[PDB]
Each structure stands twice: as C-alpha cells, then as structure tokens.
Amino acid sequence: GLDTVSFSTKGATYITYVNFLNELRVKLKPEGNSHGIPLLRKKCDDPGKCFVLVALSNDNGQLAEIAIDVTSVYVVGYQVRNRSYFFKDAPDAAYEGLFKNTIKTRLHFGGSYPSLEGEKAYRETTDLGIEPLRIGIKKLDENAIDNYKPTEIASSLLVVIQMVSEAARFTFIENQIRNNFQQRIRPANNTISLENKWGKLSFQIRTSGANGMFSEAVELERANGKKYYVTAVDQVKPKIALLKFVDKDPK
Ligand SMILES: *[C@@H]1O[C@H](CO)[C@@H](O)[C@H](O)[C@H]1NC(C)=O
C-alpha cells in the first residue's frame, strides 16, 4: 500500500522534472517542519507504507521501479522486469517486504557514496542530466539478469540517487539539474558538500532556537572547493526542500 510517482524521459522537460520532484516531496509525507522547512518522519518501520515507488521509464519503454525510504529519501532497491535488486545494506524488513513476486537478489555493494566508489562510480566523474538518466534506466533493465555487471548498476544508481533522492532533498541540486536538463553536467564541490552534509544541516536546523543559530557551524564548499561555514538556518534555507529528522548530532 505504497504511494507511487512516475517520471518518463520521453518528451521530458525541465518542467515535467520539477513537477515530478514536487509530487515526490508531497508523497514522502513529511510531518511538521523546522523553521518552515518540511521535516521528514522520524520513524516508519512498516515496509508496507514506508516506501514511495518511483517508476522511471525511458523513451524505449524500459522501466525501473525505485523504492525510496520516506524517512531518508534514499534508494534501497529496485525492480526491473521480474527481478529486484537491493543494496547490500538494505534492512531485512525492506528486503523481505518490498517487490514481492520477483526473483530477488542482494547486491554485493552498499548504496553509500563511498560504497558506490568501490564499484567505480564516482560523483565527480558521473554525468547527470536527461540523457544520463535515459542511459541509466536502460542499463538497469539490460542488467536484469543473473550475470549482471555491478559497475553498470552502480553508475546507473548513482545517477538515479542524485537526480531523484538528492534533488528531492535540495532545491539547490534540483535547480542545478533544472537549468542543465538537456545537458550533461557533473556535480561540483558545492553540490557534493551539500549532499554530504544533509544530515548535519538537518540536525543543526531542527535543534536551533527561534534565532536560527546553529550550536555548531556546518562546513560546506563553493564550486571551486573553497570552504565556508553555515552558522544559521537562513543561510541555507533557500537550498533545502526537506529536512531529515536527526536525533543526535551526526558525525
Ligand atoms: C573542486 O575544486 C577544484 C579546484 O580547487 C577542482 O579542480 C575540482 O574539480 C572541484 N571538484 C569538483 C567535483 O567540482
């Protein structure tokens, strides 16, 4: 009994992409907010209503259905044809509860960025855009076999994770893609540092008082790599679409 959201690359435009992200943001059903920013649910154990299925299909009709966690917006696994694949670190409840009636497989790598790098998929060298998305979908479908190529699945999921999960979390990433939609771009140091700091930013924002002052500054980077520190909500609020509910200071 999960919510579902679709995104087709056929005839896709920067507008269909943005509308898709906002539909996803709604279906993740955040509860409450912190300083006006929607706050994702803290806990949601039941696999039967704690995942949103994103149906990604390309011009050729190839389909990949991605399961996205409603508390973290992270990809835990996906279904292609009559097969399903899960990251090595997907919890047991999710592995058993999702994509029933499929031939199930647990991947030999995790979904974290450093785990994906282990499979040769690096954010710095992975193109993002509508074409990279079409190719990623294609590759996930092509690898719906026993002897699948982990490097292809890893790079394809890296594209999906950033264009869906990270873009849904950050209006900044959403817009880097929105105005480069028909092109191929690779995230710079600013995008990468934002992605890396979603949990820390979420914690400092949620635990701040009415003045929005962070108890501890969060380090981010400009495109060129120059470091800067976020010390207040207002400094980063226009860049965030969803906040993770973080209990204790992450690190
Ligand atoms: C970060 O900035 C450096 C310049 O200091 C640049 O060479 C590098 O490519 C940047 N990294 C990314 C992924 O943008």
Our answer to whether residue 219 is catalytic in this structure is: no
- Tell me how far CA of residue 245 lies from CA of 64, 119, 153, in angstroms: 28, 30, 29
Pocket, ligand 1, Cβ cutoff 6 A: 124, 188-189, 192, 224-225
Q: Give the integer Cα–Cα distance in Å for 58 and 173.
A: 22
Eight-state DSSP code of residue 27:
H
Question: Which residues make up the CATH 4.10.470.10 domain(s) of the chain?
Answer: 169-251
Q: What separation in Å is there between the alpha carbon of 236 and the centre of ligand 1? A: 21
What atom of ligand 1 comes closest to residue 221's alpha carbon? 1
Chain region(s) in the chain for CATH 3.40.420.10: 1-168
Q: Domain 169-251 - what CATH class? A: few secondary structures
Any residues with CB less than 8 A from the CB of 19 and at least 6 apart, and which? none
Q: Is 1-168 CATH 3.40.420.10?
A: yes
Which atom of ligand 1 sits closest to the CA of residue 190? Answer: 14
Q: Is 149 exposed, middle or buried (0-12, 13-18, 19+ CB in 10 A)?
A: middle
Q: Whose CA is nearest to atom 14 of ligand 1?
A: 188
Q: How far is CA 141 from CA 31, 157, 205, in A?
A: 35, 12, 40
Instruction: Give the active site residue among 166, 174, 195, 221.
Output: 166
Q: How far is CA 118 from CA 29, 83, 108, 113, 150, in A?
A: 33, 24, 10, 9, 10
What's the reported resolution, in angstroms, to a tenth? 1.6
